[model samples]
Target: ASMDNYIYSIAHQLYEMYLQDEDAFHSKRDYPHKKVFTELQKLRKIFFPDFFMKHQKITESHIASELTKLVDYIKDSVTAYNDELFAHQCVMAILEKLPSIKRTLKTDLIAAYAGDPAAPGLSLIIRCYPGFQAVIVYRIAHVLYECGERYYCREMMESVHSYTSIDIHPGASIKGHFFIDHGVGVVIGETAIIGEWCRIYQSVTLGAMHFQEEGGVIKRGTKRHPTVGDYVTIGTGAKVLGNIIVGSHVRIGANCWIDRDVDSNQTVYI
Candidate 1:
């Protein structure tokens, strides 16, 4: 063959190789957590700018444009993982809850400041606290989970875990006024239900006794974790496992292992 014909043949062979992999052409092959996190930071800036100085670059129009861009990104991600019909609804559902998430995060910050005597300022909690960071990510991821975007929600929560060393499943139900001081090593499972005004310390685990699996496949969804009521305090290294109920105003001591129910106004120690 002539040189030009040989070159054309080589190009066609390369195209054939590329066409062989269906996953390469699909959008769901890779997770978009990095872009998602970057957009989340931009959102935080729009809601709460630099406390010490004015952000001259941020404006109402800028926020609006960035939000549109973020929503598009989320829609694309959802479409990649799920049906195209659900993409727009998932993004809209999350956008509708952004204001509420921001307000709830503010309450979480207040709880962190009030619950920790060592916390010097609210600004410090917002900027430097890992617990606050984890909580914020959870709130955002929770909205996605509520909207039935579980895979992407888990990805966002995993990204948060990478950033803060705190693992909280997006499926967990958490109320406002929640505080996690020194959140490193803290783990909350998928079915865990936490009430308002709950404060938990480092290394605490609200987890399951065991999973329900059959036929070599784990159950899709079930209540396996514990339920903690309002005004509860879980100390460092405490493990609350199984489907037990912990009543309001209960305090669990450090390193304690709880697998049974506890009444209101009770304290459990090791």
Candidate 2:
């Protein structure tokens, strides 16, 4: 439970960081992976002292162990996270398939490499990229959220949010091979469902029409997110709000607030 609490707490911090500024950590590419990783390390060093630190003075072994521990923590955290939400078995199925997830993310890396003109190669993206960190973490956490562990899934994604400024809700059902270009301020709601090959620029919000409420308390669950179909393009500052569906192959212009269902091949311009 302590480990669960620790993982969830860090995830909360990550989400709050995004609530502050979506691009706060991603603006600097010089140390994208390092900077966020450093913060994660700081967190690990503080909470999981016994697991992350064993020697009188920490050594390379300690660092390696720490990374291993965090990775495992994230893996289990996703399972425990989604289980809380009672997501379908299919959602957990995707999460259990780590090999497939890695392949999907590998393609995502290739896409990111190809998408960015400044990046030299996929290797460079993997070796020195905060964007990669955010993408990988989001991919895993998103799966958990879809499977049913909304709290922990969001928690994991929020961890990357702290360093990436990409606020993606774990409960958001985003397909594999998803990519964000010049990624900034991309906010996907808890129930938002985005299809594969969907491209969104900075400041795009695939949001909900309204939050859930029950009695006097805000409802914990209930579909309140939008559905973005495949090959859809959402431009900068676009807000696709509500429980409506954006059809396949659709192109949405910037600064438009969408709340109704749209048809395929539709071009929405504000």
Candidate 3:
């Protein structure tokens, strides 16, 4: 009676709101985390197979086919025709840059091996280290972000974080020879720019201290995180926040809270 009419009235108002602002009611696509991760794993297997599986070959055509399928998956899931084309271009670009990413990851492996005396070998780091896994995923996700697949790339990075517990934003620009030891609880913000040969330990945060707003809305694109230079080492639990800069060869001690610029060759302690 009146209750049923009340329910329909509320539903009718919600439907009317949807017509008033359809953007809020856009179709929800299930994120293709599994497909993206699967393709990435396949690429890794093909690129660096085990000793026994070394002879298990993957030809260029096969690689192209696999990448095409990945692109198709993204296209179907996102269902934005022009965005799909951009995503396809992004995938192909990643394929072209795969060798460079591998080479950079090899440097990361060596850094991990050298940084930790307990580390057995490069293969062990490549095979089992969460830090290495995070970097590899970041490299791929970064490329996707660069190619304008922002939402999809962020989803991919979050999925990687869920698997590895290393929360690195895909928008962070990290140079080669980077290493994160015991990477759990590490958080790198979107605007962070790290130079080559940098090392970071567990629980370190390169984050923003504050937010800037524009007309009552938080600004979309702005530099909020720190800039770390080459040859820097951030010890465990240290936080370098805001738009501050840490110069080259700087060492930040464990548990230190840094909010100001530290000059080159300086050592900051708690």
Candidate 4:
């Protein structure tokens, strides 16, 4: 599994979430803190092994120290990638989105802790949440993508996808406070737009309009993906396809296939 793929998955979903619902994507929600805590621990063990797990008896102080360093690195890395992805003008445009991205990342961290069972407190979750890291990296990459820095966004998201089996497109245009539970095998396409405070489970694929074989050298910028609204919760193995609109507070159950628009506050289960 290439690290590039992991990064791609994360970046893609973040973009989609931002575009669809900015509020819920960034808003607060009832989250499972414990499960998310354990998940974060696993993520830290795998991704940033050096700083996160060097000491045996990990404490809140250690975690706080490491987190400061980690956040600094993330900011620096995003800045560096900005230069590599979109030159100067585009990078400047993306700068404004940084604060929002940071907020989204914080929400992800809290969500992970609330999602986890093993996590004892917020402090421990801060020291050991993998999904939090994934979300942070994805948000940064998504910002770069918004800045027209496609290369950097794709690269970062792919890296996360390789590990988590969650694939997100860099160009998806997601918003803040986006949440994913049991976030395995989640795929968000390039043209998709998902709003904030949305909940998505495992094996959920929010994809673009997949063309069957076009005649010419297929061009870019085709409208192919779904636009998901805020406060929506999609169950496991759900596939939302084509350029459709999923309204706010909609619940799509597991294994459902959606090819058309859905009204708000509706529940569809298969």
Question: Evaluated with TM-score, which candidate comes out highest?
Answer: 1
User: What lDDT does each candidate get?
Assistant: 0.74, 0.61, 0.70, 0.61
Which residue pairs in candidate 3 have backbone atoms (N, alpha carbon, C) closer than 3 angstroms, thus clashing? none
Query: Which residue runs does candidate 1 get wrong by more than 4 Å?
Result: 1-36, 51-54, 211-216
- Give the Cα RMSD of candidate 4: 10.6
Estimated TM-score for each candidate: 0.81, 0.65, 0.77, 0.64
How high is the lDDT of residue 181 in model 4? 63
Off by over 4 Å in 2: 1-35, 38-68, 75-95, 128-131, 209-215
The lDDT, on a scale of 0 to 1, for candidate 1 is 0.74
Tell me the TM-score of model 1. 0.81
**Rank list by TM-score:** 1, 3, 2, 4
Candidate 4 lDDT, 197-269, residue by residue in tens: 7777888989955466766666677778899988888888999998899999999998999999999999998
Where in model 4 is the C-alpha error above 4 Å? 1-97, 111-120, 123-130, 209-211
Candidate scoring better on TM-score of 2 and 3: 3
Off by over 4 Å in 3: 1-40, 51-82, 211-216
Best model number under lDDT: 1
> TM-score for model 2?
0.65
Residue 206 in candidate 3 has what lDDT? 97
lDDT of 1 at 15: 30
Q: Write the per-residue lDDT of candidate 1 for residues 133-179, one digit (tens) a residue.
A: 78877887788888878788888788878887899999999999989
lDDT of 2: 0.61
